[PDB]
Ligand binder design. Structure first.
Ligand SMILES: C[C@@H]1N[C@H](CNC(=O)Cc2c[nH]c3ccccc23)[C@@H](O)[C@H](O)[C@@H]1O
Ligand SMILES: C[C@@H]1N[C@H](CNC(=O)Cc2c[nH]c3ccccc23)[C@@H](O)[C@H](O)[C@@H]1O
Ligand SMILES: C[C@@H]1N[C@H](CNC(=O)Cc2c[nH]c3ccccc23)[C@@H](O)[C@H](O)[C@@H]1O
Ligand SMILES: C[C@@H]1N[C@H](CNC(=O)Cc2c[nH]c3ccccc23)[C@@H](O)[C@H](O)[C@@H]1O
Lengths: 442, 442, 442, 442
């Protein structure tokens, strides 16, 4: 048994399956998905925090933006829904009438994802399962359906791992004042013993009802409730050893760390398991204002995943569905394109380990990322070189044998000074999709 | 922003308006106002604490006195209302049928008060506003009206500041046993996490609904909830910088200290902002047993205010209304008499600062109090000397020019040894009301 | 009597004398003054923190810099003194041969400072009084003399207040590794209970031997000793109620806050008493590498003092003496120039209060600052306008009379709209020194 | 950079080198080595704890045993040395006359150890480096020499890693009463803040002087000093990221856990890195009373190492030198025998990982252990089967090919049901040393 204390919980380390999975889907879906609107201002880490809450690109922060009068959101809301339409009222319009979980799980599997994590309760405090601790949930209002439960069955049926996202740190059902500056987060929080019990009970309920593969908390854990985590994590791991927990609880233990857009993104191998998270666009919740100008292209998604993976992380890519339960085509296209590249190069991604270095670049600037599997070293070019002579800056190989990953075709190479030169016949180069992938073997 | 920590909250100091206001009205009004009865035993600080709770002169402690069987209150209650009439039942008789807030605010303005503070919830736990945290409040029972809200609108309309009194330390809705000796207060308290959340939520609600100018807590704050105060005070000050908080929370921060009847009354200038509080009689809640023998006379009120003001404090004088919402004539007379003296000498009170010393006395014992405004020094005699030669013991002046405050008439004076001698023509002396006021200028 | 608890200690506020003084002299003098060397990189707040400790402009940090091999300091040191020359050896070369405390105190009085505060122990742990808790002090090594005591006697004889600076948060006699990045400050500290005791005993000793007017701590207080400050502060204030403490203790109590170079510098009225400190140059300890290019000019010193005072602060200007005890000419001249300015304009500085706004500016870019003394409002221009026509933006006066400070000459003005226009006769303008000053009365 | 907090320190995991090393040498050497005497009662975990301290088989506990009047040790001591001969006197007889650190390091390298860890200070408080915090150390007494430093230099020159063992939880220089029962350990400890500081300063000093590869603490850490470990650990890892700490600190962080004799020994895959330690005999300190009857034989040493490694651990085998610095022949021979075995079979040990199961057994009772190196699975029998027909119970392979490790000879096998059958040609069998080893590939 794991015991209820940090020294003992330290024994649990990130499970094998998570380390090997590399790619998962995040799903931010809630009553905010109905207005589904935000100012697509920019990437977290690049927008000045003096403006951020006032021009918030995270559409799921709609209620908070709505409480800031004379915020683009406030204006949009009054013209669209009216001054007398309270935010909570959206739970009645959140009907998920066109929702088909098996259809979601299938798309996620086709996309190459090995795990799925939906928002069981985001900052607005509305719960997507039949919790017994509040009536502001999807069984009693809106869909009249246990979304978490139904989605979990669907994802598992598809053979994918299922985790849960819970907003332990924020619950706007316990505050009245909006967050306007980062500073406000230090005091506009539920704060009561009551809320700390609520959060503990709700996560315990998620563990009991769905035994998730990942407990993904956000925004820290209520100070008054932090000690409870020793008990909750021991309870969880004892029921599910292969379960995992992220790093946003504000306590000693965690199985993997997280980075969001520019925030906490590692420049090199970090030395611990981590996971990068971002929306396909700038929001997590569905944003009707985003167009392709705001989203990653398939090529960019692939480069993202590869960079993240070569630095030891998993990519937890977010999808933001509509109030009706459908996934916007802009997002679907991208998921399928990524899936297509993973069907082809999966073997250089899935189940891989980091190598001695994550990165290299060609003489003319083509970035290169490395992954490994025992003695086999995968060389992933972010893009496909045009010529056949290829010069890799600052790399020597002691493999004696380098092959073209897609064909298996052995290739010609030599250590030329502090560099590595290789010849790739344009006919092979012509077969690669978004990345030229070579495979060395020492 | 103020941050949620004592070092940061230390930045907030008592607002200018409070320092300059000098006089405010306290209002203890609740369901205890209906029986409106107590043994007018004496002044707090003068009654032996071995008798106090058994012969309690604070009529608002009626429920506690009622729980002590064979207490004068218990006897009175049984003969008047019956053994089977529970205290809570008074919320149904508390109807405030003759209540007119604008009439109260007007009387308070005429009385010279610059701020008003009613009991939003006293020790019996009954709430005079539509709190969502209990049904034992004035909207659901008794008046079927938000007294706090309605009074706040009225006081503001009158141009007066509005604060709130909250009983954080005691709530007899969470105990069954009465307080019989001071010692009992150390353990007969709500004590739960639940009550600590309740108190925090209720004060947060008062801040949200009415944004008061003063948070006046009484009887300390629940131990389990003390840390919450960092968050509540930062939240409050960030919404209302010119807001203020008293010293009865039992935590590091406070904007002004308090003294009650003899308790904590300063003998000289104390070095910090404070406020003296007392009833016009011996009770705060309306007491039908008090007659004029038990109340301060206008002259005494004036002497009180002047003494307090000259020592840097504000006087927070209590009015105890009846169950019907009316203010007893004995109290009204006194408020108006004080008002009349303030209309005449306000300038030597309002907006003043302390001088080098608060006090002096004449050769024949007439007490003298000093206040200041830049270079002008007000000399207030508690009473009006009969002769014209006046000798002030242990005072020298370096003003060269002393005037009679009401007329402006320059007067004759000289430093005669360790004393100050001045001649005030009986015709001027004959114009002063309760106090001879001179005005020096160095 | 103050009791040893934060609630009680809050009763003590900044004493009058400190609020009215406005200008004090800081003295960083120690064995680091012997080598007197630093690379003058720039001002704190503007030099990138990843470079700061590697090219530290604070010459008093010489020892820390010496501990970073191949840092400008290391190279300089080895070339000048050799590798076999440990930092501590400077305690013996520290002889203060030409030191004359009365000359120092005369100079500070001429400069217009009203208080003086020498480093009793800086980060290197060397003590400049005969402490009984360490032999690494000035009585036993170098000067063979009680520098603190002798200076206090001279300062007090000159009529000035005397404080003490003590590095409670850092002591390099208890660590080996140097600070290279700001983050190091979180773990490279003495850390022991023994150090917490030592610090306590040393500050208590300073209170016992010299009863300073200000306890100026730096770099926070040892975590293990924080609770000790309740006792130390109560002990200090009960012996000296007009004593004061700054805000670098990291506990709930402080009498005035501080800002250093750009750090925590307020852009407008803060709402609490504070004090600004900086070197005449970019270092506190004497740096023989600085030239006038690195120093504030008398005019800038004057503008610094005016901006600071208008914002309610005091300026604590640092002078960095030489190992021999003499004050470099570049620093002595600026002290003098500032003293000259204070002799003419002091009445618009000493004893003033903040006005409604700290700042304004003329239609042509000349900045303005305000100070107050009752009904008198000082208008201080940071420079001397060339034309007799002066348009102050976004300002209106209801004074009726505006004089020209140095001559007293009533002047012609009128609120022309959202502005205020005044005519200053070139004859007057030409009489002012660094700042044109007007005085307005309401 | 690691920050001084448990959450941040969790980012540091067991370094690769420690995981791959598998075998290290422990050295308990101190003044207790002079008397070198203990009653060899039995193994920890099997001797009743109500007798254990009274007939302690750990000769390094000599002083504690001496403090129990009429314990075998007391009687022995008095007969051999006399009553007027205090334990501390052995510090002077501790001369290490024949000590040669390079011979030790040569021997450990031959034995196949990849790291070495000497006792820098055991329970008796005697230090074997020239610490500046006590005079009871090897530079000032006995050896007149820095044992730790000199040994580190020799170990590192031989290519091995160097760690340090420090008795942070016990120091008999700070107590008088001996431990008689396990319960005593709860209150008979130094207990003072001074001791907590001393321990901190001593481990910091070891990090500063030798930057060990492993900080091996024993008996927990002083309660008053636990919070110090956040700083010490961050300080250590920021200077040496490949450094490591064990799990005897009693705080949230550790890089590998430990088991001693029977205590905490795992029966199967634990799921975290750990290390097993034991003496060649029943004592850590040299015990001249032990004969080969009390020692593991080379074969048992080999079986211990295999069981340990198959379970993911490292074996930390203790050798107990004599006061003169020589290693008893009984211990030197076993080290050698083990080294011989590691030279032949090392490739199935160093650098391996655990497989799906640690263990198996042949139909006839011969135990089996598995280790892994990618696709290669080592099958290590604890002994050499006599017949060429080998039936392994409850095992099936999907490898297709199984070689005989030392010769490489492909072998005949087939899953006969719930078992696996392999034919090992007596010619091969007869070539193996202590263990038959097969290698299987998938
Ligand atoms: C996945 C996204 N996480 C956001 C919160 N996190 C942050 O903004 C940045 C952050 C990084 N690490 C953290 C740890 C604790 C709290 C916040 C963060 C949420 O506010 C968004 O709504 C969305 O759910
Ligand atoms: C204004 C009056 N205050 C009383 C409580 N205070 C005390 O009896 C004396 C007191 C002075 N300072 C304090 C601080 C904390 C708690 C009590 C006191 C209340 O019990 C009365 O009912 C009334 O509201
Ligand atoms: C007056 C100067 N103070 C420096 C320490 N303070 C800082 O570097 C910056 C600072 C501003 N406010 C603070 C509060 C606590 C700790 C540090 C600072 C010292 O390091 C310099 O040697 C010098 O004594
Ligand atoms: C390596 C040996 N360690 C002993 C201390 N530990 C124990 O007796 C048993 C033990 C196992 N795991 C632990 C964790 C913390 C404290 C003690 C133990 C010491 O008493 C011996 O002298 C020897 O140094």
């Amino acid at each position: 048994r794991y015991k209820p204390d940090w020294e003992s919980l330290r024994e649990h380390t990130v499970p094998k399956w998570f380390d090997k999975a590399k790619f998962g889907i995040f799903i931010h879906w809630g009553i905010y998905s109905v207005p589904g609107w935000a100012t697509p201002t920019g990437e977290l880490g690049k927008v000045p925090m003096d403006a951020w809450f006032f021009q918030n690109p995270y559409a799921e922060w709609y209620e908070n933006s709505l409480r800031i009068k004379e915020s683009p959101t406030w204006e949009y809301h009054v013209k669209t829904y009216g001054e007398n339409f309270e935010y909570e009222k959206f739970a009645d319009l959140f009907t998920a009438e066109k929702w088909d979980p098996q259809e979601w799980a299938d798309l996620f599997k086709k996309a190459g994802a090995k795990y799925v994590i939906p928002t069981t309760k985001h900052h607005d405090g509305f719960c997507l399962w039949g919790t017994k601790y509040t009536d502001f949930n999807s069984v009693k209002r809106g869909p009249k359906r246990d979304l978490v439960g139904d989605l979990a069955k669907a994802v598992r049926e598809a053979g994918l791992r299922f985790g849960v996202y819970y907003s332990g740190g924020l619950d706007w059902r316990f505050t009245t004042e909006p967050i306007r500056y980062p500073e406000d987060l230090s005091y506009i929080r539920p704060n009561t013993y009551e809320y700390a019990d609520y959060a503990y009970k709700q996560v315990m309920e998620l563990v009991d009802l769905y035994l998730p593969d990942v407990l993904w908390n956000d925004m820290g854990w209520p100070e008054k409730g932090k000690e409870d985590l020793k008990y909750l994590f021991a309870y969880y791991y004892n029921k599910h050893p292969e379960g995992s927990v992220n790093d946003r609880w504000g306590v000693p233990h965690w199985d993997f760390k997280t980075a969001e857009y520019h925030v906490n993104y590692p420049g090199d191998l970090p030395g611990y398991k981590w996971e990068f998270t971002r929306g396909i666009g700038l929001s997590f919740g569905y944003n009707r204002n985003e167009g392709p100008e705001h989203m990653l292209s398939v090529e960019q998604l692939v480069y993202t995943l590869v960079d993240v993976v070569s630095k030891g992380g998993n990519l937890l890519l977010n999808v933001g569905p509509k109030g009706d339960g459908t996934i916007p085509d802009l997002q679907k296209e991208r998921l399928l394109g990524l899936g297509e590249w993973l069907r082809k190069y999966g073997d250089a991604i899935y189940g891989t380990s980091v190598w001695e270095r994550c990165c290299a670049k060609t003489e003319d600037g083509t970035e290169i990322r490395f992954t490994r599997k025992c003695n086999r070293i995968f060389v992933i070019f972010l893009g496909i070189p045009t010529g056949e002579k290829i010069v890799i800056e600052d790399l020597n190989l002691s493999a004696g044998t380098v092959r073209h990953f897609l064909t298996g075709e052995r290739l010609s190479f030599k250590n030329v000074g502090k560099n590595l030169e290789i010849t790739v016949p344009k006919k092979l180069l012509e077969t690669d999709s978004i990345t030229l992938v070579l495979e060395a073997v020492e």
